[PDB]
Design an enzyme around this catalytic site. Structure first.
Site, mmCIF file in Angstrom:
data_model
loop_
_atom_site.group_PDB
_atom_site.id
_atom_site.type_symbol
_atom_site.label_atom_id
_atom_site.label_comp_id
_atom_site.label_asym_id
_atom_site.label_seq_id
_atom_site.Cartn_x
_atom_site.Cartn_y
_atom_site.Cartn_z
ATOM 1 N N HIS A 61 0.830 -1.341 0.157
ATOM 2 C CA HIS A 61 -0.125 -0.045 0.007
ATOM 3 C C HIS A 61 0.944 1.347 -0.064
ATOM 4 C CE1 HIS A 61 0.233 0.881 4.452
ATOM 5 N NE2 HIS A 61 0.296 -0.335 4.561
ATOM 6 N N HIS A 64 8.475 2.139 2.901
ATOM 7 C CA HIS A 64 8.655 2.593 4.450
ATOM 8 C C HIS A 64 10.183 2.470 4.494
ATOM 9 C CE1 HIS A 64 4.970 1.257 6.972
ATOM 10 N NE2 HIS A 64 4.885 2.023 5.772
ATOM 11 N N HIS A 93 2.351 9.728 1.879
ATOM 12 C CA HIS A 93 1.022 9.784 1.373
ATOM 13 C C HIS A 93 0.816 10.722 -0.040
ATOM 14 C CE1 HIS A 93 -0.529 7.363 4.913
ATOM 15 N NE2 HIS A 93 0.403 8.238 5.562
ATOM 16 N N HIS A 116 5.338 11.696 6.760
ATOM 17 C CA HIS A 116 4.943 11.335 8.060
ATOM 18 C C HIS A 116 6.224 10.984 8.607
ATOM 19 C CE1 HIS A 116 0.318 10.765 7.350
ATOM 20 N NE2 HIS A 116 0.620 11.945 7.662
ATOM 21 N N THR A 196 -3.760 6.795 10.104
ATOM 22 C CA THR A 196 -4.575 7.311 8.838
ATOM 23 C C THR A 196 -5.110 6.174 8.162
ATOM 24 O OG1 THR A 196 -2.800 7.877 7.532
ATOM 25 C CG2 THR A 196 -3.744 9.858 8.856
ATOM 26 N N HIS A 197 -4.463 4.732 8.698
ATOM 27 C CA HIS A 197 -4.951 3.650 8.020
ATOM 28 C C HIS A 197 -5.124 2.643 9.151
ATOM 29 C CE1 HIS A 197 -0.682 2.531 7.982
ATOM 30 N NE2 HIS A 197 -0.473 3.573 7.382
#
Ligand SMILES: [Zn+2]
Length: 257
Positions: A61, A64, A93, A116, A196-197
């Protein structure tokens, strides 16, 4: 299965993650004129050790950049916090348009992308695992990206993406200090929100930078170029990963200026 498409995207998440409909969900829209100047706020002070950088990984998704967190070598202090948080990661994002990809919104305005920088309370919890679910467990700096001019401090990050093309690919990523990615002044908004997920824990104290940083369309194109499929399968691009905003529901957003 939770994602960003129609069948499993943000509008469905609640079927599974009932906490989706909580009272401390993120992102929120920031209304500058309803924000509240708190004189107790301190400047945030970051101290990263570039040697803590570890790996970069494709999670289907998103991607990282993970950090060694067995020490207080890379910490965040100041702002609202009276103890220090240990750095564990950064990620981004974005949306399917170069113009509409931020999670947080300012005065109804959606930016192109959002970085983030996530930390956990080492003072109080034993690990990120424990911490992740507690009210005061995480702290994330959010930086609004605005499409314009190429941002050359993102180069070491983009070159690295070549090696993590599909889901589950990892690569070493070292001697990197993320504090190179923050804006010039570090004035901020802060509020109590969550991830946020999924799992959508309301375990996060947000720190949104008043100042934005840039990125160009083609940089952005790059993110959107990763794949969500495993290697050998039909290509499914990492088109977008941003959540729409959530009612504020009694929360107060404070400003450090
Ligand atoms: Zn995020």
């Amino acid at each position: 299965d939770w994602g960003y498409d129609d069948k499993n995207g943000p509008e469905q998440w609640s079927k599974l993650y009932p906490i989706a409909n909580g009272n401390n969900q993120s992102p929120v829209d920031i209304k500058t004129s309803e924000t509240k100047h708190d004189t107790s706020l301190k400047p945030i002070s970051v101290s990263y050790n570039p040697a803590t950088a570890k790996e970069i990984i494709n999670v289907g998704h998103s991607f990282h950049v993970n950090f060694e967190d067995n020490d207080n070598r890379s910490v965040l202090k100041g702002g609202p916090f009276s103890d220090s948080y240990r750095l564990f990661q950064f990620h981004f994002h974005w949306g399917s348009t170069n113009e509409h990809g931020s999670e947080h919104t300012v005065d109804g305005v959606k930016y192109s992308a959002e970085l983030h920088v996530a930390h956990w309370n080492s003072a109080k919890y034993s690990s990120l695992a424990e911490a992740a679910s507690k009210a005061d467990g995480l702290a994330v700096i959010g930086v609004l990206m605005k499409v314009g001019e190429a941002n050359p401090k993102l180069q070491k990050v983009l070159d690295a993406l070549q090696a993590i093309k599909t889901k589950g690919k990892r690569a070493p990523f070292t001697n990197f200090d993320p504090s190179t990615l923050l804006p010039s002044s570090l004035d901020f908004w802060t509020y109590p929100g969550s991830l946020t997920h999924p799992p959508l824990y309301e375990s996060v104290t947000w720190i949104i930078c008043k100042e934005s940083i840039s990125v160009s369309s083609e940089q952005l194109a790059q993110f959107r170029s990763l794949l969500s499929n495993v290697e050998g399968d039909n290509a499914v691009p990492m088109q977008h990963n941003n959540r729409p905003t959530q009612p504020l529901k009694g929360r107060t957003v404070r400003a450090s200026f």
